[PDB]
């Protein structure tokens, strides 16, 4: 379930990441994209600034890394 934002791991381009929020009653956003391990850190450290507490977003970085490792071989 939602709070006001979510952040749910998947994606299926070979090499992929997922970085969702949700915000506001109509807009109903949810983006998925990226490759690289650096760009994985960065646009979740920025997400931390605009939200809070390191440990969960940080964890949902190698979940993705392991998925983008797996989709190689």
């Amino acid at each position: 379930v939602t709070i006001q934002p979510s952040g749910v791991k998947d994606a299926a381009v070979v090499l992929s990441t997922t970085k969702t929020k949700k915000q506001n009653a109509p807009a109903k956003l949810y983006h998925k994209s990226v490759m690289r391990k650096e760009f994985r850190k960065m646009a979740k450290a920025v997400k931390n600034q605009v939200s809070d507490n390191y440990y969960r977003p940080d964890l949902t970085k190698p979940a993705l890394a392991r998925l983008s490792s797996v989709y190689r071989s």
């Binding site: 791991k9 964890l59 979940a63 392991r66 998925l67 490792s69 797996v70």
Partner: protein, 133 residues
């Protein structure tokens, strides 16, 4: 910490094994434990050699509770979806594939789990669908 707590339930036990009393001398009379109900009962009298009765103090340490002896926490996995959560745990948790899940289904879970880096019970059971020594 954990290692010691795991060892305090597993190598001590308690394995008396609480069997119903005199279950052995009638076959039908079932193994499942029943409280010795009536006054003369020696077990009821809560004697030693009489086999201990169940009470709360007998209980394991919480830190060691519902763990496999491996000390991994088992999580039952119906399908691939449960796998995501398990993957997060990885180190913490072991995945156990339900008996029901079918042979055609079982394959996808197994491979996904490895990629997840949650090798546990599942490997054993997949060689168990293959045949084998």
């Amino acid at each position: 910490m954990a290692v010691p707590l795991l060892t305090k339930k597993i190598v001590k036990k308690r394995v008396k094994q609480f069997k119903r009393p005199h279950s052995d001398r009638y076959i039908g009379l079932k193994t499942s434990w029943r409280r010795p109900k009536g006054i003369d009962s020696r077990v009821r009298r809560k004697f030693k050699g009489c086999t201990l009765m169940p009470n709360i103090g007998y209980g394991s340490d919480k830190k060691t509770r519902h763990y496999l002896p491996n000390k991994f926490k088992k999580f039952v996995v119906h399908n691939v979806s449960e796998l995501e959560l398990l993957m997060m745990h990885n180190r913490t948790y072991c995945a156990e594939i339900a008996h029901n899940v079918s042979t055609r289904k079982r394959k996808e879970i197994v491979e996904r789990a490895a990629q997840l880096d949650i090798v546990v019970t599942n490997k054993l059971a997949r060689l168990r669908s293959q045949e084998d020594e």
